[PDB]
Amino acid sequence: TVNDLLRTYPADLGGVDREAMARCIEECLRCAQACTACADACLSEPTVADLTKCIRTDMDCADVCTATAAVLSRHTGYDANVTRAVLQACATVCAACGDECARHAGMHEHCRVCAEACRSCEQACQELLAGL
Amino acid sequence: DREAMARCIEECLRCAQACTACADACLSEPTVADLTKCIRTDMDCADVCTATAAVLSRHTGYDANVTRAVLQACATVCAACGDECARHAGMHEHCRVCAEACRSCEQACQELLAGLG
Amino acid sequence: VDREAMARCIEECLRCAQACTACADACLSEPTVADLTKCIRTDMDCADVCTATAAVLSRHTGYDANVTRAVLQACATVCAACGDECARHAGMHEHCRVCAEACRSCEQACQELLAGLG
Amino acid sequence: DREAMARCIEECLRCAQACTACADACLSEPTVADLTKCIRTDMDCADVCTATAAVLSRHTGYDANVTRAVLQACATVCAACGDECARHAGMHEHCRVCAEACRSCEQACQELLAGL
Numbered sequence: 221t222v223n224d225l226l227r228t229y230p231a232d233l234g235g236v237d238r239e240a241m242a243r244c245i246e247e248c249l250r251c252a253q254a255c256t257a258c259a260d261a262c263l264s265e266p267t268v269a270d271l272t273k274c275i276r277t278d279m280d281c282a283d284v285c286t287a288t289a290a291v292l293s294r295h296t297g298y299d300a301n302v303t304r305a306v307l308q309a310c311a312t313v314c315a316a317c318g319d320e321c322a323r324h325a326g327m328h329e330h331c332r333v334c335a336e337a338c339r340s341c342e343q344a345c346q347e348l349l350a351g352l
Numbered sequence: 353d354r355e356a357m358a359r360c361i362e363e364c365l366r367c368a369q370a371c372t373a374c375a376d377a378c379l380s381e382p383t384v385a386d387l388t389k390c391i392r393t394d395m396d397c398a399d400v401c402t403a404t405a406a407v408l409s410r411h412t413g414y415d416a417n418v419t420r421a422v423l424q425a426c427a428t429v430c431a432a433c434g435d436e437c438a439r440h441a442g443m444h445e446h447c448r449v450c451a452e453a454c455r456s457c458e459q460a461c462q463e464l465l466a467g468l469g
Numbered sequence: 470v471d472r473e474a475m476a477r478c479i480e481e482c483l484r485c486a487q488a489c490t491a492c493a494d495a496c497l498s499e500p501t502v503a504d505l506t507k508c509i510r511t512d513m514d515c516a517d518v519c520t521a522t523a524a525v526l527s528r529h530t531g532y533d534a535n536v537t538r539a540v541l542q543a544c545a546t547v548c549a550a551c552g553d554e555c556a557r558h559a560g561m562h563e564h565c566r567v568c569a570e571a572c573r574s575c576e577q578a579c580q581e582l583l584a585g586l587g
Numbered sequence: 588d589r590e591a592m593a594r595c596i597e598e599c600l601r602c603a604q605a606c607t608a609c610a611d612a613c614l615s616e617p618t619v620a621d622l623t624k625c626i627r628t629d630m631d632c633a634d635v636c637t638a639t640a641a642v643l644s645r646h647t648g649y650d651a652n653v654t655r656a657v658l659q660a661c662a663t664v665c666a667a668c669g670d671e672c673a674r675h676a677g678m679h680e681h682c683r684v685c686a687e688a689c690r691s692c693e694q695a696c697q698e699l700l701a702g703l
């Protein structure tokens with residue numbers, strides 16, 4: 221669907237890596253879902269009081285990944301400054317979320333899944349950023 | 353159900369992205385002046401689906417009234433967006449793709465809504 | 470006449486979203502966080518729906534009363550639920566008292582607009 | 588200083604709403620074909636300001652790198668949106684109002700960023 225809409229856009233996109241752009245959008249949507257699920261699972265743990273930083277960072281990562289996917293999906297009136305700045309924010313938050321979840325991943329499968337999604341999204345954002 | 357909940361969350365996030373992409377494609381059409389209702393409805397559908405995905409991710413069974421009310425709003429907006437994009441789908445492949453994403457999301461929301469009661 | 474009520478509801482929704490996010494964050498920092506998890510979840514839901522609602526209401530191009538009423542109904546429902554949950558903790562936590570007042574005010578502004586359309 | 592954080596959150600939510608309204612107003616102009624970059628940038632600014640308001644509401648000082656990165660994105664988008672709307676502000680009152688909201692938000696985000 222993401223690649224579909226990208227191919228039907230009514231103009232040339234410059235020379236942005238189209239396949240990398242589509243991959244990053246897809247990763248951001250998967251990552252947002254993984255983060256929201258991790259936040260919800262942490263909230264239901266009896267040890268929730270020890271997982272508050274994890275929860276907060278999950279929520280931040282979901283919000284930024286959702287914003288990022290939206291900004292990346294838009295090509296009209298493209299502004300490299302905005303796109304680069306949002307990708308950099310997303311990479312930073314995904315790295316932070318990955319770090320926090322990795323600390324709980326031994327104990328909680330939900331944080332293991334979330335950490336993998338965040339690392340993958342971090343890498344897809346960094347790759348797109350380098351390719352612009 | 354959990355599996356149906358996760359399917360609906362995924363559909364909502366894809367739908368929001370499809371609507372954003374459709375709005376942007378419409379905005380770049382030379383005939384943009386004829387696509388303004390499509391663009392506005394896409395924007396509404398993106399905002400409601402984004403909210404819906406977030407609300408559903410935190411669903412616990414407790415206060416099903418909230419979940420049902422949000423699902424109903426989402427189904428309604430997806431159907432409206434699907435109807436508008438379907439009008440331009442013969443001419444614009446982006447609206448065809450968007451209409452399909454909205455119908456899929458509409459159906460996933462209706463299915464989940466029926467399964468909560 | 471719809472427009473002044475629409476603007477009032479948009480303003481209420483933005484105040485409500487901020488109050489809910491602040492309440493969720495304050496609950497998260499309480500030593501008793503384990504007892505406030507439903508409050509936190511509902512605050513987050515109310516912030517998301519109020520932000521969506523304010524955006525839908527701000528748009529007049531290609532207006533469709535059915536969509537607007539459906540979103541307002543969702544918003545009214547979530548504000549009422551959030552108001553109820555925060556009211557349970559309002560005796561103990563000032564943040565939940567403030568949030569409950571914002572949600573009731575937003576609930577009422579959404580119900581008023583809904584009745585006036587439809 | 589927590590009051591500054593709350594002020595910035597409020598500004599971000601107002602800015603998102605102002606951008607949404609400007610995008611909608613532009614969409615209804617007969618000259619919409621000339622306003623597409625304004626509309627697109629308004630939509631980006633709404634999404635980023637919405638994200639920013641949420642991130643800031645949960646800020647604890649722990650991982651300041653996240654908050655700073657988000658504020659930097661927000662400042663950049665608000666500046667871009669402010670620039671584009673300022674170009675149409677002579678002709679469209681909606682873009683004048685939106686440009687003022689974006690400049691205020693840009694400045695509040697830059698100020699907060701410097702203070703962390």
Ligand SMILES: [Cu+2]
Binds near residue numbers: 258331
């Ligand atoms: Cu987890």
Ligand SMILES: [Cu+2]
Binds near residue numbers: 433434437450
């Ligand atoms: Cu569509």
Ligand SMILES: [Cu+2]
Binds near residue numbers: 483485544
């Ligand atoms: Cu509200």
Ligand SMILES: [Cu+2]
Binds near residue numbers: 489512554564565569
């Ligand atoms: Cu509360």
Ligand SMILES: [Cu+2]
Binds near residue numbers: 482547571572575576
């Ligand atoms: Cu409310």
Ligand SMILES: [Cu+]
Binds near residue numbers: 251252342
């Ligand atoms: Cu991501």
Ligand SMILES: [Cu+]
Binds near residue numbers: 252254
């Ligand atoms: Cu994530």
Ligand SMILES: [Cu+]
Binds near residue numbers: 257259260274278331
């Ligand atoms: Cu988690």
Ligand SMILES: [Cu+]
Binds near residue numbers: 254277278314
């Ligand atoms: Cu995350």
Ligand SMILES: [Cu+]
Binds near residue numbers: 282284286341
């Ligand atoms: Cu993320």
Ligand SMILES: [Cu+]
Binds near residue numbers: 285309310313342345
């Ligand atoms: Cu990210």
Ligand SMILES: [Cu+]
Binds near residue numbers: 318
């Ligand atoms: Cu992440």
Ligand SMILES: [Cu+]
Binds near residue numbers: 277
């Ligand atoms: Cu995570």
Ligand SMILES: [Cu+]
Binds near residue numbers: 320
């Ligand atoms: Cu975790």
Ligand SMILES: [Cu+]
Binds near residue numbers: 258320330332334
């Ligand atoms: Cu996690």
Ligand SMILES: [Cu+]
Binds near residue numbers: 254255321334335336
């Ligand atoms: Cu993650």
